[PDB]
Coordinates of N, CA and C and ligand atoms in Angstrom, one line a residue:
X1 N 109.9 80.4 109.3 CA 111.0 81.1 109.4 C 111.3 81.8 111.1
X2 N 112.3 81.8 111.1 CA 112.4 82.6 112.7 C 112.3 84.1 112.5
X3 N 111.1 84.7 113.0 CA 111.1 86.3 112.7 C 112.1 87.0 113.5
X4 N 112.5 86.5 114.5 CA 113.5 87.5 115.4 C 115.0 87.7 115.0
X5 N 115.2 86.7 114.1 CA 116.3 86.5 113.3 C 116.3 87.4 112.1
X6 N 115.1 87.3 111.2 CA 115.0 88.0 110.0 C 114.8 89.4 110.4
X7 N 114.0 89.8 111.6 CA 114.5 91.7 112.0 C 115.6 92.1 112.6
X8 N 116.6 91.0 113.2 CA 118.0 91.4 113.7 C 118.9 91.6 112.7
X9 N 118.6 90.5 111.6 CA 119.9 90.4 110.4 C 119.1 92.1 109.4
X10 N 118.0 92.2 109.6 CA 117.4 93.2 108.5 C 118.0 94.8 109.0
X11 N 117.9 94.5 110.5 CA 118.6 96.0 111.3 C 120.0 96.1 111.3
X12 N 120.5 95.3 111.2 CA 122.2 95.3 111.1 C 122.8 95.8 109.8
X13 N 121.6 95.4 108.7 CA 122.2 95.6 107.2 C 121.4 97.1 107.4
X14 N 120.5 97.7 107.2 CA 120.2 98.8 107.4 C 121.4 99.9 108.2
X15 N 121.4 99.8 109.7 CA 122.7 100.6 110.4 C 123.9 100.3 109.6
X16 N 124.4 99.3 109.1 CA 126.0 99.2 108.3 C 125.5 100.2 107.5
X17 N 124.6 100.0 106.7 CA 124.7 101.3 105.6 C 124.8 102.4 105.9
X18 N 124.3 102.7 107.1 CA 124.7 104.4 107.3 C 125.9 104.5 108.2
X19 N 126.9 103.7 108.6 CA 128.2 103.8 109.1 C 127.9 103.2 110.5
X20 N 127.0 102.3 110.7 CA 126.9 102.1 112.2 C 127.1 100.5 111.9
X21 N 127.5 100.1 113.4 CA 127.9 98.2 113.6 C 127.4 98.1 114.7
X22 N 126.1 97.6 114.7 CA 125.3 96.9 115.6 C 125.2 96.0 116.3
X23 N 125.5 95.8 117.4 CA 125.8 94.4 118.3 C 124.6 94.3 119.4
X24 N 116.6 80.1 103.9 CA 116.8 81.1 105.1 C 117.7 82.1 104.5
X25 N 118.8 82.1 104.0 CA 119.6 82.9 103.6 C 119.0 83.9 102.3
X26 N 118.8 83.2 101.5 CA 118.2 83.5 100.3 C 116.7 84.7 100.9
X27 N 116.3 84.3 101.9 CA 114.9 85.3 102.3 C 115.4 86.7 102.7
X28 N 116.8 86.6 103.7 CA 117.1 87.6 103.7 C 117.8 88.6 103.1
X29 N 118.4 87.7 101.9 CA 118.9 88.6 100.9 C 117.7 89.1 100.1
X30 N 116.9 88.2 99.9 CA 115.5 88.9 98.7 C 115.0 90.2 99.8
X31 N 114.9 90.0 100.9 CA 113.9 90.8 101.9 C 115.2 92.3 101.5
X32 N 116.3 92.3 101.8 CA 117.4 93.2 101.7 C 117.3 93.9 100.6
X33 N 117.3 93.4 99.3 CA 116.8 94.1 98.0 C 115.9 94.6 97.7
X34 N 114.8 94.1 98.5 CA 113.4 94.5 98.0 C 113.3 96.1 98.9
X35 N 114.0 95.9 100.1 CA 113.6 96.9 101.0 C 114.6 98.2 100.4
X36 N 115.9 97.9 100.0 CA 117.0 98.7 99.0 C 115.8 99.4 98.0
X37 N 115.1 98.6 97.0 CA 114.3 98.6 96.1 C 113.4 100.0 96.4
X38 N 112.7 99.3 97.3 CA 111.4 100.4 98.0 C 112.1 101.6 98.1
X39 N 113.2 101.8 98.8 CA 113.8 103.4 99.3 C 114.2 104.2 98.3
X40 N 114.4 103.5 97.2 CA 115.4 103.9 95.8 C 113.6 104.4 95.0
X41 N 112.8 103.4 94.9 CA 111.5 104.2 94.3 C 110.6 105.3 95.0
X42 N 110.5 104.7 96.1 CA 109.4 106.0 97.0 C 110.9 106.8 97.6
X43 N 111.4 107.7 96.6 CA 112.8 108.5 97.3 C 112.0 109.5 98.0
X44 N 111.5 110.4 97.9 CA 110.7 111.3 98.7 C 110.1 110.7 99.9
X45 N 109.2 109.8 99.8 CA 108.9 109.2 101.2 C 109.8 108.8 102.3
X46 N 110.9 108.0 101.5 CA 111.8 107.3 102.3 C 112.4 108.8 103.1
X47 N 113.0 109.7 102.1 CA 113.6 111.1 102.6 C 113.2 111.8 103.8
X48 N 111.5 111.7 103.6 CA 110.8 112.7 104.6 C 110.7 111.8 105.8
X49 N 110.7 110.3 106.0 CA 110.1 109.6 107.2 C 111.1 110.3 108.3
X50 N 112.5 110.2 108.4 CA 113.4 110.7 109.3 C 112.6 111.8 110.1
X51 N 112.4 112.8 109.4 CA 112.1 114.1 110.1 C 110.7 113.9 110.3
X52 N 109.8 113.0 110.3 CA 108.6 113.2 110.8 C 108.4 112.2 112.0
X53 N 109.5 111.6 112.4 CA 109.6 110.4 113.7 C 109.4 111.0 115.0
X54 N 110.1 112.4 115.2 CA 110.3 113.0 116.2 C 110.6 112.4 117.5
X55 N 111.5 111.5 117.4 CA 111.8 110.2 118.5 C 112.3 110.9 119.7
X56 N 111.7 110.2 120.8 CA 112.0 110.5 122.2 C 112.3 109.0 122.8
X57 N 112.7 109.2 124.0 CA 112.7 108.0 124.7 C 111.4 107.4 125.0
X58 N 110.6 108.2 125.3 CA 109.2 108.0 126.2 C 108.1 107.7 124.8
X59 N 108.4 108.5 123.8 CA 107.4 108.5 123.0 C 107.7 107.8 121.4
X60 N 109.1 106.6 121.5 CA 109.2 105.9 120.3 C 108.3 104.8 119.9
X61 N 108.0 104.2 121.2 CA 106.9 102.7 121.0 C 105.9 103.4 120.4
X62 N 105.2 104.6 120.8 CA 104.0 104.9 120.4 C 104.1 105.4 118.9
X63 N 105.1 106.3 118.7 CA 105.4 106.4 117.0 C 105.3 105.2 116.2
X64 N 106.2 104.4 116.6 CA 106.4 102.9 115.9 C 105.0 102.5 115.6
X65 N 104.1 102.3 116.5 CA 102.9 101.7 116.6 C 102.1 102.4 115.8
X66 N 102.0 103.9 115.5 CA 101.2 105.0 114.8 C 101.5 104.6 113.2
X67 N 102.7 104.9 113.2 CA 102.7 104.6 111.8 C 102.8 103.5 111.2
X68 N 102.9 102.3 112.0 CA 102.7 100.9 111.5 C 101.3 100.7 111.4
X69 N 100.2 100.9 112.0 CA 98.8 101.0 111.8 C 98.1 101.8 110.8
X70 N 99.0 102.9 110.5 CA 98.7 103.6 109.3 C 99.0 102.5 108.2
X71 N 100.4 102.0 108.0 CA 100.7 101.5 106.9 C 99.9 100.4 106.5
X72 N 99.5 99.5 107.2 CA 98.6 98.2 107.5 C 97.2 98.8 107.4
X73 N 96.6 99.9 107.4 CA 95.4 100.0 107.7 C 94.2 99.0 106.5
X74 N 94.6 99.4 105.4 CA 93.8 98.5 104.6 C 94.1 97.4 104.2
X75 N 95.1 96.5 105.1 CA 95.2 95.3 104.8 C 96.5 95.1 104.8
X76 N 97.2 93.6 104.5 CA 98.6 93.2 104.2 C 98.8 93.0 102.8
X77 N 99.9 93.3 102.7 CA 100.4 92.6 101.3 C 102.0 92.5 101.3
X78 N 102.8 92.0 100.4 CA 104.3 91.8 100.6 C 105.0 93.2 100.3
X79 N 104.5 94.1 99.4 CA 104.9 95.4 99.6 C 105.0 96.4 100.9
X80 N 103.8 96.2 101.6 CA 104.0 96.6 102.8 C 104.6 95.9 103.9
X81 N 104.7 94.8 103.7 CA 105.6 94.3 104.5 C 106.9 94.7 104.4
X82 N 107.4 94.9 102.9 CA 108.6 95.2 103.1 C 108.9 96.4 103.7
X83 N 108.0 97.3 103.2 CA 107.9 99.1 104.0 C 108.2 98.9 105.5
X84 N 107.0 98.1 105.8 CA 107.2 97.6 107.3 C 108.8 97.6 107.6
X85 N 109.6 97.1 107.3 CA 111.1 96.7 107.6 C 111.6 98.0 107.7
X86 N 111.4 98.6 106.3 CA 112.3 99.9 105.9 C 112.2 100.7 106.9
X87 N 110.7 100.9 107.4 CA 110.3 101.7 108.7 C 111.3 101.3 109.8
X88 N 110.9 100.2 110.3 CA 111.8 99.8 111.3 C 113.4 100.5 111.0
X89 N 114.0 100.2 109.8 CA 115.5 100.5 109.6 C 115.3 102.2 109.9
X90 N 114.9 103.1 109.1 CA 114.7 104.2 109.6 C 114.5 104.5 111.0
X91 N 113.7 103.9 111.8 CA 113.9 103.9 113.4 C 115.1 103.8 114.1
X92 N 115.7 102.8 113.7 CA 116.9 102.2 114.2 C 117.8 103.4 113.7
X93 N 117.9 103.7 112.7 CA 119.2 104.6 111.9 C 119.0 106.1 112.8
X94 N 117.7 106.4 112.8 CA 117.3 107.8 113.6 C 117.8 107.4 115.2
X95 N 117.8 106.8 115.6 CA 117.7 106.4 117.2 C 119.2 106.4 117.4
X96 N 120.1 105.7 116.5 CA 121.3 105.8 117.0 C 121.9 107.4 116.2
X97 N 121.7 107.8 115.2 CA 122.1 109.2 114.9 C 121.8 110.1 116.2
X98 N 120.5 110.2 116.9 CA 119.9 110.7 117.7 C 121.0 110.5 119.3
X99 N 121.9 109.8 119.1 CA 122.6 109.2 120.8 C 121.4 108.4 121.4
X100 N 120.4 107.7 120.8 CA 119.4 106.9 121.6 C 119.8 105.7 121.4
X101 N 121.0 105.2 120.9 CA 120.9 103.8 120.4 C 120.0 102.7 121.3
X102 N 120.2 102.7 122.7 CA 119.7 101.9 123.6 C 118.2 101.2 122.8
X103 N 117.2 102.4 122.0 CA 115.9 102.2 121.5 C 116.2 101.0 120.4
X104 N 117.3 101.0 119.8 CA 117.8 99.7 118.8 C 116.8 98.8 119.5
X105 N 117.1 98.3 120.3 CA 116.8 96.7 120.8 C 115.2 96.8 121.1
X106 N 114.8 97.8 121.3 CA 113.3 97.7 121.9 C 112.5 97.7 120.3
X107 N 113.1 98.5 119.3 CA 112.3 98.6 117.8 C 112.6 97.1 117.8
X108 N 113.8 96.3 117.9 CA 113.8 94.8 117.3 C 112.6 94.2 118.0
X109 N 112.4 94.4 119.2 CA 111.3 93.9 119.7 C 110.1 94.1 119.1
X110 N 109.8 95.2 119.0 CA 108.5 95.9 118.4 C 108.3 95.2 116.9
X111 N 109.2 95.5 116.3 CA 108.7 94.5 115.1 C 109.0 93.0 115.2
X112 N 109.5 92.5 115.9 CA 109.1 91.0 115.8 C 107.7 90.9 116.5
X113 N 107.8 91.5 117.5 CA 106.2 91.4 118.3 C 105.0 91.4 117.0
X114 N 105.3 92.5 116.6 CA 104.1 93.1 115.6 C 104.3 91.3 114.1
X115 N 105.2 90.9 114.0 CA 105.4 90.3 113.2 C 104.9 88.9 113.6
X116 N 104.7 88.2 114.8 CA 104.4 87.1 115.5 C 103.0 87.5 115.4
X117 N 102.9 88.4 116.0 CA 101.1 88.7 116.3 C 100.3 89.2 115.0
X118 N 100.6 90.1 114.4 CA 100.0 90.6 113.4 C 100.2 90.4 111.9
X119 N 101.5 89.7 111.4 CA 101.5 89.3 110.2 C 102.0 88.0 110.0
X120 N 102.2 87.1 111.1 CA 102.2 85.8 110.8 C 101.4 85.0 109.8
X121 N 99.8 85.4 110.7 CA 99.2 84.7 109.8 C 98.6 84.6 108.4
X122 N 99.2 86.3 107.9 CA 98.9 86.6 106.5 C 100.0 85.7 105.9
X123 N 101.0 85.9 106.3 CA 102.2 85.2 105.5 C 102.2 83.9 105.3
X124 N 101.4 83.0 106.6 CA 101.6 81.6 106.6 C 100.5 81.3 105.2
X125 N 99.2 82.2 105.4 CA 98.1 81.9 104.2 C 98.3 81.9 102.9
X126 N 99.8 83.0 103.0 CA 99.9 83.5 101.5 C 101.3 82.7 101.1
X127 N 101.7 81.6 101.3 CA 102.7 80.8 100.9 C 103.9 81.0 101.6
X128 N 104.0 81.9 102.9 CA 105.1 81.9 103.6 C 106.4 82.8 102.8
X129 N 107.6 83.1 103.1 CA 108.5 83.7 102.8 C 108.9 83.1 101.7
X130 N 108.8 82.0 101.3 CA 109.3 80.9 100.2 C 108.1 81.6 99.2
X131 N 107.1 82.0 99.1 CA 106.1 82.8 98.0 C 106.7 84.0 97.6
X132 N 107.1 84.8 98.9 CA 108.0 86.0 98.7 C 109.0 85.8 97.9
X133 N 109.8 85.2 97.8 CA 111.2 84.7 97.3 C 111.0 84.4 95.9
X134 N 109.7 83.8 95.9 CA 109.6 83.2 94.5 C 109.0 84.6 93.6
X135 N 108.5 85.6 94.3 CA 108.1 86.4 93.8 C 109.0 87.4 93.1
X136 N 109.9 88.0 94.0 CA 110.9 88.6 94.4 C 112.4 88.5 94.5
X137 N 112.6 87.3 94.5 CA 113.9 86.7 94.7 C 114.6 86.6 93.1
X138 N 115.7 86.4 92.8 CA 116.0 86.0 91.7 C 116.4 84.6 91.5
Ligands
LIG201 C1 112.8 91.8 92.0 N1 112.6 93.1 92.7 C2 113.3 93.9 91.2 C3 110.9 93.7 92.3 C4 111.1 95.1 92.7 C5 109.5 95.6 93.3 C6 109.6 97.0 93.2 S1 110.3 97.9 94.7 C7 109.3 97.6 95.9 C8 109.7 96.8 97.2 C9 108.8 96.9 97.9 C10 107.7 97.2 98.4 C11 107.3 98.2 97.3 C12 108.2 98.4 96.0 N2 108.9 94.9 94.1 C13 107.6 94.8 94.7 C14 106.8 95.3 93.8 C15 105.3 95.4 94.4 C16 104.8 94.9 95.4 S2 103.3 95.0 95.6 O1 102.6 95.2 94.7 O2 102.9 93.9 96.7 N3 103.1 96.4 96.9 C17 103.5 97.6 96.4 N4 103.7 98.0 95.1 S3 103.9 99.6 95.0 O3 103.0 100.3 94.3 O4 105.4 99.9 94.4 C18 103.8 99.7 96.9 C19 104.0 100.9 97.4 C20 104.0 100.8 99.0 N5 104.2 102.1 99.7 C21 103.8 101.7 101.4 C22 104.2 102.8 102.1 N6 104.2 104.5 101.6 C23 104.7 105.4 102.4 C24 103.8 105.2 103.8 C25 102.4 105.2 104.0 C26 102.2 104.9 105.4 C27 102.9 104.6 106.5 C28 104.2 104.4 106.4 C29 104.5 104.6 105.0 C30 106.4 104.7 104.9 C31 107.2 105.5 104.4 C32 108.6 105.5 104.5 C33 109.3 104.3 104.9 CL1 111.0 104.1 105.0 C34 108.1 103.4 105.4 C35 107.0 103.2 105.1 C36 104.7 104.2 100.1 C37 104.0 103.2 99.3 C38 103.5 99.6 99.9 C39 103.0 98.5 98.7 C40 103.6 98.5 97.5 C41 105.7 94.3 96.2 C42 107.1 94.3 95.7 N7 108.0 94.0 96.6 O5 107.7 93.7 97.7 O6 109.3 93.6 96.7

Protein backbone atom coordinates (compact mmCIF):
# COMPACT_ATOMS: atom_id res chain seq x y z
CA UNK A 1 0.00 0.00 0.00
CA UNK A 2 1.01 3.64 -0.49
CA UNK A 3 2.23 4.97 2.86
CA UNK A 4 1.96 8.65 1.96
CA UNK A 5 -1.72 8.12 1.21
CA UNK A 6 -2.31 6.19 4.43
CA UNK A 7 -0.76 9.07 6.39
CA UNK A 8 -2.55 11.92 4.59
CA UNK A 9 -5.94 10.26 4.93
CA UNK A 10 -5.32 9.56 8.62
CA UNK A 11 -4.26 13.13 9.32
CA UNK A 12 -7.23 14.58 7.43
CA UNK A 13 -9.58 12.45 9.55
CA UNK A 14 -8.03 13.41 12.90
CA UNK A 15 -8.08 17.13 12.05
CA UNK A 16 -11.69 16.95 10.86
CA UNK A 17 -12.77 15.44 14.19
CA UNK A 18 -11.39 18.56 15.89
CA UNK A 19 -13.14 21.00 13.57
CA UNK A 20 -10.26 21.59 11.15
CA UNK A 21 -10.47 20.96 7.42
CA UNK A 22 -7.05 20.15 6.00
CA UNK A 23 -5.79 20.67 2.44
CA UNK A 24 -7.15 -0.18 0.29
CA UNK A 25 -10.25 1.69 1.42
CA UNK A 26 -10.85 -0.97 4.07
CA UNK A 27 -7.30 -0.38 5.35
CA UNK A 28 -8.00 3.33 5.97
CA UNK A 29 -11.31 2.63 7.68
CA UNK A 30 -9.88 -0.14 9.85
CA UNK A 31 -6.92 2.02 10.84
CA UNK A 32 -9.32 4.90 11.65
CA UNK A 33 -11.44 2.78 13.94
CA UNK A 34 -8.47 1.21 15.71
CA UNK A 35 -7.08 4.69 16.35
CA UNK A 36 -10.38 5.94 17.76
CA UNK A 37 -10.50 2.77 19.88
CA UNK A 38 -6.94 3.30 21.11
CA UNK A 39 -7.62 6.88 22.22
CA UNK A 40 -10.83 5.84 23.94
CA UNK A 41 -9.12 3.01 25.83
CA UNK A 42 -5.95 4.89 26.77
CA UNK A 43 -8.01 7.95 27.72
CA UNK A 44 -5.58 9.53 30.17
CA UNK A 45 -2.49 8.87 28.03
CA UNK A 46 -4.30 10.42 25.04
CA UNK A 47 -5.56 13.42 27.02
CA UNK A 48 -2.14 14.12 28.47
CA UNK A 49 -0.11 13.78 25.27
CA UNK A 50 -0.91 17.22 23.83
CA UNK A 51 0.24 18.99 27.03
CA UNK A 52 3.62 17.24 26.84
CA UNK A 53 4.44 18.34 23.28
CA UNK A 54 5.60 21.93 23.87
CA UNK A 55 5.64 22.43 20.08
CA UNK A 56 7.69 25.21 18.53
CA UNK A 57 8.57 25.61 14.88
CA UNK A 58 12.19 24.54 15.50
CA UNK A 59 11.65 21.77 18.09
CA UNK A 60 8.71 19.93 16.50
CA UNK A 61 10.84 17.57 14.41
CA UNK A 62 12.85 16.51 17.45
CA UNK A 63 9.77 16.14 19.63
CA UNK A 64 8.30 13.79 17.04
CA UNK A 65 11.55 11.80 16.84
CA UNK A 66 11.78 11.53 20.63
CA UNK A 67 8.27 10.25 21.29
CA UNK A 68 8.42 7.80 18.38
CA UNK A 69 11.73 6.33 19.59
CA UNK A 70 10.17 5.72 22.98
CA UNK A 71 7.04 4.22 21.45
CA UNK A 72 8.94 1.60 19.46
CA UNK A 73 11.88 1.09 21.83
CA UNK A 74 10.92 -2.52 22.64
CA UNK A 75 10.04 -3.39 19.06
CA UNK A 76 7.17 -3.10 16.62
CA UNK A 77 3.64 -4.47 16.72
CA UNK A 78 0.25 -3.51 15.28
CA UNK A 79 -0.85 -1.75 18.49
CA UNK A 80 2.21 0.49 18.57
CA UNK A 81 1.76 1.29 14.89
CA UNK A 82 -1.81 2.47 15.61
CA UNK A 83 -0.49 4.53 18.55
CA UNK A 84 2.09 6.02 16.15
CA UNK A 85 -0.70 7.23 13.86
CA UNK A 86 -2.62 8.56 16.87
CA UNK A 87 0.50 10.40 18.02
CA UNK A 88 0.91 11.98 14.59
CA UNK A 89 -2.73 12.97 14.84
CA UNK A 90 -2.23 14.70 18.20
CA UNK A 91 0.81 16.54 16.80
CA UNK A 92 -1.19 17.82 13.84
CA UNK A 93 -4.18 18.91 15.92
CA UNK A 94 -1.89 20.69 18.37
CA UNK A 95 -0.07 22.38 15.47
CA UNK A 96 -3.27 23.75 13.95
CA UNK A 97 -4.62 24.74 17.38
CA UNK A 98 -1.45 26.70 18.17
CA UNK A 99 -1.56 28.58 14.84
CA UNK A 100 1.34 26.52 13.49
CA UNK A 101 -0.55 24.83 10.64
CA UNK A 102 2.52 24.78 8.38
CA UNK A 103 3.86 22.02 10.68
CA UNK A 104 1.14 19.67 9.45
CA UNK A 105 2.84 19.03 6.10
CA UNK A 106 6.13 18.44 7.91
CA UNK A 107 4.61 15.97 10.34
CA UNK A 108 2.97 14.11 7.46
CA UNK A 109 6.42 13.90 5.89
CA UNK A 110 8.08 12.63 9.07
CA UNK A 111 5.36 9.99 9.54
CA UNK A 112 5.71 8.87 5.93
CA UNK A 113 9.49 8.64 6.19
CA UNK A 114 9.31 6.70 9.45
CA UNK A 115 6.84 4.26 7.84
CA UNK A 116 9.00 3.80 4.74
CA UNK A 117 12.30 3.48 6.59
CA UNK A 118 11.49 1.84 9.90
CA UNK A 119 8.12 0.08 9.80
CA UNK A 120 7.90 -1.12 6.19
CA UNK A 121 9.93 -4.26 6.76
CA UNK A 122 8.10 -5.34 9.89
CA UNK A 123 4.80 -4.70 8.15
CA UNK A 124 5.71 -6.84 5.12
CA UNK A 125 7.18 -9.59 7.33
CA UNK A 126 3.94 -9.75 9.34
CA UNK A 127 1.36 -10.14 6.58
CA UNK A 128 1.11 -6.53 5.41
CA UNK A 129 -1.87 -4.27 6.06
CA UNK A 130 -4.07 -7.16 4.92
CA UNK A 131 -3.16 -9.08 8.07
CA UNK A 132 -3.87 -5.98 10.20
CA UNK A 133 -7.28 -5.79 8.56
CA UNK A 134 -7.88 -9.49 9.19
CA UNK A 135 -7.09 -9.07 12.90
CA UNK A 136 -8.91 -5.82 13.62
CA UNK A 137 -11.23 -5.16 10.70
CA UNK A 138 -14.86 -6.32 10.54
C1 LIG B 1 -11.70 -4.62 16.38
N1 LIG B 1 -11.33 -3.66 17.41
C2 LIG B 1 -12.45 -3.45 18.33
C3 LIG B 1 -10.13 -4.14 18.11
C4 LIG B 1 -9.74 -3.16 19.24
C5 LIG B 1 -8.42 -3.47 19.97
C6 LIG B 1 -8.30 -2.62 21.26
S1 LIG B 1 -8.05 -0.81 21.07
C7 LIG B 1 -6.37 -0.56 20.64
C8 LIG B 1 -6.02 -0.22 19.32
C9 LIG B 1 -4.67 -0.02 19.00
C10 LIG B 1 -3.67 -0.15 19.99
C11 LIG B 1 -4.03 -0.50 21.31
C12 LIG B 1 -5.38 -0.70 21.64
N2 LIG B 1 -7.25 -3.30 19.10
C13 LIG B 1 -6.01 -3.77 19.34
C14 LIG B 1 -5.78 -4.52 20.52
C15 LIG B 1 -4.51 -5.02 20.84
C16 LIG B 1 -3.45 -4.77 19.95
S2 LIG B 1 -1.82 -5.38 20.30
O1 LIG B 1 -1.90 -6.44 21.32
O2 LIG B 1 -1.10 -5.55 19.03
N3 LIG B 1 -0.98 -4.10 21.05
C17 LIG B 1 -1.47 -3.45 22.18
N4 LIG B 1 -2.39 -3.88 22.97
S3 LIG B 1 -2.69 -2.82 24.21
O3 LIG B 1 -2.22 -3.44 25.47
O4 LIG B 1 -4.05 -2.27 24.16
C18 LIG B 1 -1.51 -1.64 23.68
C19 LIG B 1 -1.16 -0.40 24.24
C20 LIG B 1 -0.16 0.36 23.58
N5 LIG B 1 0.23 1.57 24.03
C21 LIG B 1 1.39 2.27 23.45
C22 LIG B 1 1.38 3.80 23.71
N6 LIG B 1 1.30 4.02 25.16
C23 LIG B 1 1.51 5.43 25.51
C24 LIG B 1 2.79 5.94 24.87
C25 LIG B 1 4.03 5.39 25.31
C26 LIG B 1 5.24 5.81 24.72
C27 LIG B 1 5.23 6.78 23.69
C28 LIG B 1 4.00 7.31 23.24
C29 LIG B 1 2.77 6.89 23.81
C30 LIG B 1 1.57 7.55 23.24
C31 LIG B 1 0.71 8.33 24.04
C32 LIG B 1 -0.41 8.99 23.47
C33 LIG B 1 -0.67 8.86 22.09
CL1 LIG B 1 -2.04 9.66 21.40
C34 LIG B 1 0.17 8.08 21.28
C35 LIG B 1 1.30 7.43 21.85
C36 LIG B 1 -0.02 3.52 25.60
C37 LIG B 1 -0.01 1.99 25.42
C38 LIG B 1 0.47 -0.16 22.41
C39 LIG B 1 0.10 -1.42 21.87
C40 LIG B 1 -0.90 -2.14 22.54
C41 LIG B 1 -3.64 -4.04 18.77
C42 LIG B 1 -4.92 -3.51 18.46
N7 LIG B 1 -5.05 -2.76 17.19
O5 LIG B 1 -4.04 -2.54 16.53
O6 LIG B 1 -6.16 -2.34 16.88
